[PDB]
Amino acid sequence: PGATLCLGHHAVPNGTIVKTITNDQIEVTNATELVQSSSTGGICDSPHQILDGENCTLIDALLGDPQCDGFQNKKWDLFVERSKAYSNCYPYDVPDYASLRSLVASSGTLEFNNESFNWAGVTQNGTSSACKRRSNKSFFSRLNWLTHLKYKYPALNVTMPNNEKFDKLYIWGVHHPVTDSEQISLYAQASGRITVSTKRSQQTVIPNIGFRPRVRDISSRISIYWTIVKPGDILLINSTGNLIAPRGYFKIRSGKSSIMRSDAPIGKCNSECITPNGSIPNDKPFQNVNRITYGACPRYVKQNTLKLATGMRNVPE
Amino acid sequence: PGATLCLGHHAVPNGTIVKTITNDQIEVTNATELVQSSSTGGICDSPHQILDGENCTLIDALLGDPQCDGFQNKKWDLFVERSKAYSNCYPYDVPDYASLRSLVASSGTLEFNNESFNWAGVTQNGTSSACKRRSNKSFFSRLNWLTHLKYKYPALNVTMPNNEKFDKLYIWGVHHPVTDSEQISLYAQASGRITVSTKRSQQTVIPNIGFRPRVRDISSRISIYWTIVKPGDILLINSTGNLIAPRGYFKIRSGKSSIMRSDAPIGKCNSECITPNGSIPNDKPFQNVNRITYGACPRYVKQNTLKLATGMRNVPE
Amino acid sequence: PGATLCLGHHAVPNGTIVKTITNDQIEVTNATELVQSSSTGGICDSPHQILDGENCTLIDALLGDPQCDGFQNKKWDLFVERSKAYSNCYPYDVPDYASLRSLVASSGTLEFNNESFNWAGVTQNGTSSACKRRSNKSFFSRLNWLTHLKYKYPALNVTMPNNEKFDKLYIWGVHHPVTDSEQISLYAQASGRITVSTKRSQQTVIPNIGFRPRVRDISSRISIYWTIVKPGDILLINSTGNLIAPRGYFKIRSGKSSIMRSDAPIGKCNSECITPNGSIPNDKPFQNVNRITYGACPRYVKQNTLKLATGMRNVPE
Numbered sequence: 047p048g049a050t051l052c053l054g055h056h057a058v059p060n061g062t063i064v065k066t067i068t069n070d071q072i073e074v075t076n077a078t079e080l081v082q083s084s085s086t087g088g089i090c091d092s093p094h095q096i097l098d099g100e101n102c103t104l105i106d107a108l109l110g111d112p113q114c115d116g117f118q119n120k121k122w123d124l125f126v127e128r129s130k131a132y133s134n135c136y137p138y139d140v141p142d143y144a145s146l147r148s149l150v151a152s153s154g155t156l157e158f159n160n161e162s163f164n165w166a167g168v169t170q171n172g173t174s175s176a177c178k179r180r181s182n183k184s185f186f187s188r189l190n191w192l193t194h195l196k197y198k199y200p201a202l203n204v205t206m207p208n209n210e211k212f213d214k215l216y217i218w219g220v221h222h223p224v225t226d227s228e229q230i231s232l233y234a235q236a237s238g239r240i241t242v243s244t245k246r247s248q249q250t251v252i253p254n255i256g257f258r259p260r261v262r263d264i265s266s267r268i269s270i271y272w273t274i275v276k277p278g279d280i281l282l283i284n285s286t287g288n289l290i291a292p293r294g295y296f297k298i299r300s301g302k303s304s305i306m307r308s309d310a311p312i313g314k315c316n317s318e319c320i321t322p323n324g325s326i327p328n329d330k331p332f333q334n335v336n337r338i339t340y341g342a343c344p345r346y347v348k349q350n351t352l353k354l355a356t357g358m359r360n361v362p363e
Numbered sequence: 364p365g366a367t368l369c370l371g372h373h374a375v376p377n378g379t380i381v382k383t384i385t386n387d388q389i390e391v392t393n394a395t396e397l398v399q400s401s402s403t404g405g406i407c408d409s410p411h412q413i414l415d416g417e418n419c420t421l422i423d424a425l426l427g428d429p430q431c432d433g434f435q436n437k438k439w440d441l442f443v444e445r446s447k448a449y450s451n452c453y454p455y456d457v458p459d460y461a462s463l464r465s466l467v468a469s470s471g472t473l474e475f476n477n478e479s480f481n482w483a484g485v486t487q488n489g490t491s492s493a494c495k496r497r498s499n500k501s502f503f504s505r506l507n508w509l510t511h512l513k514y515k516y517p518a519l520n521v522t523m524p525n526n527e528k529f530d531k532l533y534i535w536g537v538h539h540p541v542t543d544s545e546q547i548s549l550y551a552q553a554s555g556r557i558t559v560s561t562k563r564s565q566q567t568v569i570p571n572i573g574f575r576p577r578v579r580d581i582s583s584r585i586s587i588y589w590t591i592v593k594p595g596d597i598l599l600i601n602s603t604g605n606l607i608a609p610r611g612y613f614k615i616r617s618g619k620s621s622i623m624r625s626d627a628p629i630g631k632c633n634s635e636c637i638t639p640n641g642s643i644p645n646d647k648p649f650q651n652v653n654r655i656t657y658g659a660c661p662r663y664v665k666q667n668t669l670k671l672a673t674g675m676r677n678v679p680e
Numbered sequence: 681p682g683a684t685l686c687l688g689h690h691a692v693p694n695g696t697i698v699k700t701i702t703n704d705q706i707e708v709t710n711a712t713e714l715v716q717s718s719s720t721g722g723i724c725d726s727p728h729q730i731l732d733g734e735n736c737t738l739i740d741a742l743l744g745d746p747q748c749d750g751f752q753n754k755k756w757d758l759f760v761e762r763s764k765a766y767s768n769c770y771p772y773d774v775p776d777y778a779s780l781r782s783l784v785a786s787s788g789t790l791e792f793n794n795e796s797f798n799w800a801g802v803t804q805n806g807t808s809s810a811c812k813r814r815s816n817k818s819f820f821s822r823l824n825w826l827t828h829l830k831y832k833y834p835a836l837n838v839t840m841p842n843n844e845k846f847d848k849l850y851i852w853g854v855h856h857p858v859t860d861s862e863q864i865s866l867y868a869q870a871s872g873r874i875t876v877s878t879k880r881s882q883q884t885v886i887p888n889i890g891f892r893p894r895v896r897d898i899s900s901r902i903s904i905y906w907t908i909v910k911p912g913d914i915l916l917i918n919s920t921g922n923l924i925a926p927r928g929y930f931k932i933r934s935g936k937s938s939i940m941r942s943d944a945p946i947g948k949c950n951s952e953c954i955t956p957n958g959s960i961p962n963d964k965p966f967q968n969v970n971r972i973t974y975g976a977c978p979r980y981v982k983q984n985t986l987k988l989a990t991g992m993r994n995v996p997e
């Protein structure tokens with residue numbers, strides 16, 4: 047009689063379909079998904095330091111809009127900008143807005159140090175009804191609106207040395223009056239000119255008198271500029287009118303900080319990978335949630351599923 | 364005696380050489396080419412909507428050069444710009460030319476809507492001998508050259524609200540006169556200044572009086588600018604001279620439109636993939652015709668041939 | 681009795697560990713390194729034409745700083761800029777510095793041809809104590825500082841046609857005086873304006889009077905500009921003051937030239953691949969020395985070692 051001895055292998059009743067080099071559909075005993083396609087829907091507050099902008103853009107928090115005073119000197123790994131944010135101060139623009147937003151976002155700090163600028167012979171601390179704090183007229187917290195003192199605006203020629211070990215970031219501006227009479231009334235002379243320089247760089251800005259459409263009832267504008275001053279260099283501001291003056295400087299750091307546009311709620315939880323849709327797990331190598339990411343994240347791909355076989359071909363009975 | 368039974372495989376007298384991981388030259392029974400290396404030499408008019416610029420650059424068709432009146436309000440999937448195209452109107456430049464060309468190309472339409480700007484107190488519709496239509500003096504069709512009315516040019520302070528559901532694109536300009544006397548003669552005052560604003564943006568441009576080399580016998584220049592106005596925003600033009608005024612706005616759309624530089628003839632035929640050399644078949648995954656493509660195209664690679672084996676090793680008798 | 685015949689394979693006592701698709705550590709009999717991780721520490725002078733900037737940036741060699749006269753008309757495949765380089769002429773800036781540096785670097789030549797500009801009615805060849813040659817006052821060799829002649833500066837309206845077969849690169853500038861009295865004293869009128877044009881392009885620059893921090897005891901500045909003039913086009917310079925005039929043009933070539941920041945010594949040796957750390961051998965496909973390369977170089981990767989098996993699995997006795 048003898049015996050029979052058969053060699054074989056397992057199979058399962060519920061196999062899974064994968065792709066190969068020779069066949070788009072072959073059933074294997076088991077597989078694992080390599081594309082992360084879902085989010086929790088919230089941004090976990092840990093382990094990255096999250097700063098929710100709430101009503102404030104980063105730039106409004108920088109300048110010191112009245113809704114943004116709670117942001118002073120705060121730091122972040124990720125600043126989260128909300129689509130509902132809006133300005134509630136004097137109407138302004140920033141030539142190169144994207145670059146200023148980016149460099150501050152990347153620096154990851156709003157640390158500000160006041161300095162004693164000698165604004166000899168002018169009126170300081172100008173305010174406006176378009177920028178209220180607690181119903182009083184106010185202005186951007188970090189800027190100083192200078193105007194005539196007894197119908198004189200003597201030329202400004204003011205120095206601030208950087209004897210620090212770090213770079214200083216200065217934010218300053220130019221006021222564009224609506225009319226010639228408004229120019230004379232604020233600055234006591236027909237036009238201004240502003241030259242802000244260091245040993246390595248110079249910027250000159252000319253105010254442009256005229257009507258723009260009213261925003262918070264104001265037809266004039268402020269245009270915002272910035273200047274970085276290296277250790278051992280010197281800031282020189284030379285102006286005859288229209289200067290929106292700095293009150294001091296911001297620290298610039300380098301590191302891992304960034305900014306993200308999202309309306310996802312912030313939650314008490316821990317997740318390394320952030321997207322605008324919310325935090326996502328980062329076990330998988332790929333993800334199709336969002337091209338926009340921050341942290342230790344899977345790589346964005348177009349596929350919504352990629353199954354890796356983790357078993358042999360399934361050959362059911 | 365018994366029998367003999369031999370196992371074997373086919374071969375061919377005309378095998379083809381392919382590359383592998385271990386050998387740069389191995390003969391197989393058959394192969395297929397993966398790189399498309401030839402074109403028909405013409406651009407097929409189907410299935411993409413092709414617009415041949417002929418004598419006109421896209422920007423000349425936009426502004427309304429006298430050779431380009433047939434382009435009014437036309438749409439395209441691909442605008443084809445010819446190397447022979449040249450301007451035949453007033454000499455101009457466009458700071459950022461590449462960006463204006465790109466954004467119009469991508470929008471894919473020259474749809475234009477006239478609007479009723481109230482140009483109170485000036486002469487409209489200025490023309491020039493450098494921009495003839497049918498031997499008369501003429502000008503860019505979409506622009507309005509304003510000059511003094513009885514030696515006055517009163518300040519312009521003109522509004523145009525966008526109460527549409529779409530964005531509006533405005534094209535406008537500044538005239539740079541050749542001399543101080545030409546400035547006075549056209550605008551009745553020593554200089555102009557132009558500020559074009561919305562609630563979100565502002566641009567001011569200063570005319571620059573002086574000689575440039577003569578082009579179509581003109582030593583002055585026009586410089587072209589643009590402004591996009593969102594729904595619920597308002598265009599404000601404020602100027603004292605030198606304004607080359609808009610006559611209305613262009614629609615801006617988003618979609619699949621582009622622009623290509625080519626001198627290939629347009630033909631009656633159907634091909635999904637367009638290159639500057641002509642349309643190419645798109646069965647192959649790769650191509651070495653041109654890095655510049657439009658449509659469903661193979662991917663550009665440096666290799667001129669890549670043969671994929673489609674049979675076994677060829678082992679001839 | 682019979683015989684025994686065993687099939688087998690070699691092994692070695694000193695195998696090497698490699699990575700595979702199924703195992704991060706498997707021992708093979710032999711392997712070869714695919715990542716170049718060391719440099720000689722010097723830049724080999726062959727076979728690329730190397731130009732050591734020494735004390736000179738490329739831009740200082742272009743303009744003609746007093747420390748850079750030995751660079752006149754020199755050509756390079758690779759211009760090597762040293763971190764110790766510093767300027768020793770009139771303090772200047774270049775809006776777009778990076779682009780001018782890049783285009784000259786890529787052109788690979790400082791070939792300069794003097795031209796006879798007719799500067800009618802002004803004093804030529806102005807000099808300064810901030811730009812000495814051999815203790816005399818001097819200036820940038822390739823620039824011509826024009827000032828009043830007997831308290832007149834009549835308007836300049838000067839032409840230079842390009843009747844060559846190649847493009848011409850013109851470098852020119854604007855002087856920004858420290859004060860109104862300095863402006864009058866040099867140019868005999870209250871301000872200048874400079875318009876430099878061709879048939880295709882125009883640039884106008886306004887001098888900006890004011891104090892900048894002293895550099896080599898000078899509080900004024902020069903700002904540098906450039907203009908390319910195609911064959912059959914014409915350069916037109918129109919100015920009433922403050923012009924830092926060209927003396928002629930640079931040839932612009934196209935080819936394989938570039939620029940590299942490095943403090944590595946130049947040596948007498950032959951190596952195709954240059955990095956800032958020094959030349960590296962280029963037998964390997966990859967390297968982790970520097971992302972910055974010039975010549976026939978391995979590709980930069982993050983790994984510091986990648987071992988390719990060149991033998992079978994090692995199975996010791």
Ligand SMILES: *[C@@H]1O[C@H](CO)[C@@H](O[C@@H]2O[C@H](CO)[C@@H](O[C@@H]3O[C@H](CO[C@H]4O[C@H](CO)[C@@H](O)[C@H](O)[C@@H]4O)[C@@H](O)[C@H](O[C@H]4O[C@H](CO)[C@@H](O)[C@H](O)[C@@H]4O)[C@@H]3O)[C@H](O)[C@H]2NC(C)=O)[C@H](O)[C@H]1NC(C)=O
Nearest residue numbers: 058060062075076077078079080328329330354355356357
């Ligand atoms: C189909 O094929 C897949 C892939 O092979 C199988 O999925 C694996 O299943 C095993 C067993 O369930 C999983 O193992 C468990 O996950 C963790 C593994 O530890 C590593 O990964 C985690 C991430 O979760 C890291 O944080 C960690 O540092 C390790 O690198 C453990 O958390 C689990 O722990 C449990 O067992 C241990 C044993 O000591 C205990 O300490 C704990 O109490 C706990 O109960 C466990 O080890 C593995 O994660 C799965 N991989 C994937 C990719 O999903 C399927 O099982 C298979 N299906 C079938 C039917 O065969």
Ligand SMILES: *[C@@H]1O[C@H](CO)[C@@H](O[C@@H]2O[C@H](CO)[C@@H](O[C@@H]3O[C@H](CO[C@H]4O[C@H](CO)[C@@H](O)[C@H](O)[C@@H]4O)[C@@H](O)[C@H](O[C@H]4O[C@H](CO)[C@@H](O)[C@H](O)[C@@H]4O)[C@@H]3O)[C@H](O)[C@H]2NC(C)=O)[C@H](O)[C@H]1NC(C)=O
Nearest residue numbers: 375377379392393394395396397645646647671672673674
């Ligand atoms: C060497 O190796 C190559 C690659 O395997 C072989 O080339 C193939 O040859 C076959 C047979 O000639 C070709 O088949 C023909 O092409 C079309 C295939 O249909 C698909 O592809 C077309 C693109 O052309 C798509 O539009 C379509 O939707 C399909 O996805 C058909 O158009 C042809 O149709 C003919 O036969 C059918 C049969 O029903 C009829 O309906 C028609 O009347 C018509 O006569 C046909 O099927 C195939 O395209 C070739 N592939 C490639 C990549 O070239 C060589 O044959 C082989 N050489 C040797 C000597 O063995």
Ligand SMILES: *[C@@H]1O[C@H](CO)[C@@H](O[C@@H]2O[C@H](CO)[C@@H](O[C@@H]3O[C@H](CO[C@H]4O[C@H](CO)[C@@H](O)[C@H](O)[C@@H]4O)[C@@H](O)[C@H](O[C@H]4O[C@H](CO)[C@@H](O)[C@H](O)[C@@H]4O)[C@@H]3O)[C@H](O)[C@H]2NC(C)=O)[C@H](O)[C@H]1NC(C)=O
Nearest residue numbers: 692694696709710711712713714962963964988989990991
């Ligand atoms: C472990 O595995 C590695 C990889 O297989 C082996 O390394 C190879 O070893 C051989 C033998 O020593 C090396 O061969 C020598 O290198 C040159 C080969 O010529 C080509 O490559 C050079 C670059 O060096 C090119 O310039 C040239 O154009 C060729 O493309 C030759 O320079 C050497 O020449 C010597 O022998 C010839 C024989 O005719 C003579 O003319 C000369 O006099 C001279 O003495 C020689 O051919 C090969 O380069 C190595 N490759 C690598 C990648 O390192 C190890 O040998 C192996 N180890 C063990 C223990 O098995």
Ligand SMILES: *[C@@H]1O[C@H](CO)[C@@H](O[C@@H]2O[C@H](CO)[C@@H](O[C@@H]3O[C@H](CO)[C@@H](O)[C@H](O)[C@@H]3O)[C@H](O)[C@H]2NC(C)=O)[C@H](O)[C@H]1NC(C)=O
Nearest residue numbers: 257258259260261263264265519520521522523597599601
């Ligand atoms: C130049 O043109 C602009 C734009 O048309 C003019 O601005 C407009 O000025 C009027 C008159 O002051 C503004 O009216 C105000 O509206 C508010 C809002 O309801 C109201 O509270 C005030 O009582 C007043 O009615 C109008 O808002 C403003 N329009 C825009 C778009 O800004 C400007 O007056 C013109 N200048 C001259 C000198 O003509």
Ligand SMILES: *[C@@H]1O[C@H](CO)[C@@H](O[C@@H]2O[C@H](CO)[C@@H](O[C@@H]3O[C@H](CO)[C@@H](O)[C@H](O)[C@@H]3O)[C@H](O)[C@H]2NC(C)=O)[C@H](O)[C@H]1NC(C)=O
Nearest residue numbers: 574575576577578580581582836837838839840914916918
């Ligand atoms: C400032 O410099 C420019 C450039 O040299 C001068 O422009 C030149 O002006 C002359 C005189 O009008 C032009 O001559 C004309 O040439 C045409 C072409 O054949 C001809 O049809 C006319 O009858 C006349 O001869 C010349 O073309 C022009 N050159 C360029 C390059 O534009 C300008 O005159 C100077 N201005 C002053 C005030 O000196």
Ligand SMILES: *[C@@H]1O[C@H](CO)[C@@H](O[C@@H]2O[C@H](CO)[C@@H](O[C@@H]3O[C@H](CO)[C@@H](O)[C@H](O)[C@@H]3O)[C@H](O)[C@H]2NC(C)=O)[C@H](O)[C@H]1NC(C)=O
Nearest residue numbers: 202203204205206280282284891892893894895897898899
């Ligand atoms: C406008 O503000 C600037 C900056 O404070 C003033 O520039 C400064 O001018 C003084 C007076 O000439 C310079 O002093 C000089 O220092 C050198 C260096 O040791 C020395 O050799 C001279 O004898 C003299 O003491 C000073 O260097 C300079 N500072 C900077 C940062 O450039 C300028 O004077 C002010 N202008 C007016 C009209 O007030």
Ligand SMILES: *[C@@H]1O[C@H](CO)[C@@H](O[C@@H]2O[C@H](CO)[C@@H](O)[C@H](O)[C@H]2NC(C)=O)[C@H](O)[C@H]1NC(C)=O
Nearest residue numbers: 201202203239240241284285286859860890891
């Ligand atoms: C640069 O700063 C200087 C120093 O105050 C200014 O020059 C003075 O300007 C006033 C008013 O215009 C004149 O009365 C003085 O005679 C000037 N002094 C000197 C030494 O020239 C100058 O106006 C400043 N520039 C700008 C753009 O504000």
Ligand SMILES: *[C@@H]1O[C@H](CO)[C@@H](O[C@@H]2O[C@H](CO)[C@@H](O)[C@H](O)[C@H]2NC(C)=O)[C@H](O)[C@H]1NC(C)=O
Nearest residue numbers: 082083084085087321322323324334335336337
């Ligand atoms: C995560 O959010 C992104 C961003 O909105 C979503 O991507 C958009 O998906 C819609 C379809 O609902 C498309 O119309 C848009 O093209 C996508 N937006 C952009 C800006 O490209 C995505 O659906 C979300 N993913 C998950 C898993 O929630």
Ligand SMILES: *[C@@H]1O[C@H](CO)[C@@H](O[C@@H]2O[C@H](CO)[C@@H](O)[C@H](O)[C@H]2NC(C)=O)[C@H](O)[C@H]1NC(C)=O
Nearest residue numbers: 225226256257518519520556557558601602603
């Ligand atoms: C901005 O528009 C206003 C409104 O017309 C202009 O201001 C007037 O300018 C004229 C002529 O220069 C003066 O006579 C009026 O007194 C001004 N009116 C007011 C209310 O100030 C102004 O010129 C325009 N700006 C530009 C750059 O064109």
Ligand SMILES: *[C@@H]1O[C@H](CO)[C@@H](O[C@@H]2O[C@H](CO)[C@@H](O)[C@H](O)[C@H]2NC(C)=O)[C@H](O)[C@H]1NC(C)=O
Nearest residue numbers: 399400401402404638639640641651652653654
């Ligand atoms: C398609 O057109 C391109 C564009 O001109 C051709 O590529 C050029 O080829 C010439 C050789 O005749 C080279 O000198 C140039 O470097 C290429 N041009 C550019 C701009 O890089 C190409 O030969 C054409 N291909 C086919 C298949 O017709």
Ligand SMILES: *[C@@H]1O[C@H](CO)[C@@H](O[C@@H]2O[C@H](CO)[C@@H](O)[C@H](O)[C@H]2NC(C)=O)[C@H](O)[C@H]1NC(C)=O
Nearest residue numbers: 542543573574835836837873874875918919920
């Ligand atoms: C452009 O060049 C012309 C030609 O010299 C200059 O125009 C002359 O300017 C002088 C002095 O300002 C006047 O006296 C003449 O009447 C002008 N001539 C003409 C024909 O207008 C003009 O100043 C130059 N522009 C610049 C910016 O320098």
Ligand SMILES: *[C@@H]1O[C@H](CO)[C@@H](O[C@@H]2O[C@H](CO)[C@@H](O)[C@H](O)[C@H]2NC(C)=O)[C@H](O)[C@H]1NC(C)=O
Nearest residue numbers: 716717718719721955956957958968969970971
């Ligand atoms: C070649 O030079 C580069 C450039 O400095 C070196 O890379 C730097 O390595 C240091 C560590 O000593 C890091 O802190 C820096 O991040 C690197 N620099 C930059 C600018 O990224 C590199 O070490 C050198 N490699 C060799 C083989 O000598």
Ligand SMILES: CC(=O)N[C@H]1[C@H]([C@H](O)[C@H](O)CO)O[C@@](O)(C(=O)O)C[C@@H]1O
Nearest residue numbers: 172173174175176191193223224232266
């Ligand atoms: C510093 C100063 O003088 N501020 C005044 C401003 C400016 O004159 C204009 O805003 C300039 O355009 O105007 C107000 O109507 C305002 O904005 O509230 C009153 C305010 O006191």
Ligand SMILES: CC(=O)N[C@H]1[C@H]([C@H](O)[C@H](O)CO)O[C@@](O)(C(=O)O)C[C@@H]1O
Nearest residue numbers: 489490491492493508510540541549583
């Ligand atoms: C609107 C207007 O006044 N147009 C006139 C222009 C301008 O004066 C200059 O072109 C400005 O530079 O000059 C002409 O010689 C021309 O170009 O044909 C006559 C023409 O009637």
Ligand SMILES: CC(=O)N[C@H]1[C@H]([C@H](O)[C@H](O)CO)O[C@@](O)(C(=O)O)C[C@@H]1O
Nearest residue numbers: 806807808809810825827857858866900
């Ligand atoms: C051409 C000319 O007039 N050069 C003079 C300059 C300029 O007046 C200023 O540098 C302009 O800012 O000033 C000097 O002190 C200098 O720099 O050496 C004296 C020099 O002879």
Ligand SMILES: *[C@@H]1O[C@H](CO)[C@@H](O)[C@H](O)[C@H]1NC(C)=O
Nearest residue numbers: 058059060061062075076077
């Ligand atoms: C098959 O069934 C087992 C037991 O219910 C389960 O654990 C396994 O994961 C199932 N299917 C797939 C596709 O993973």
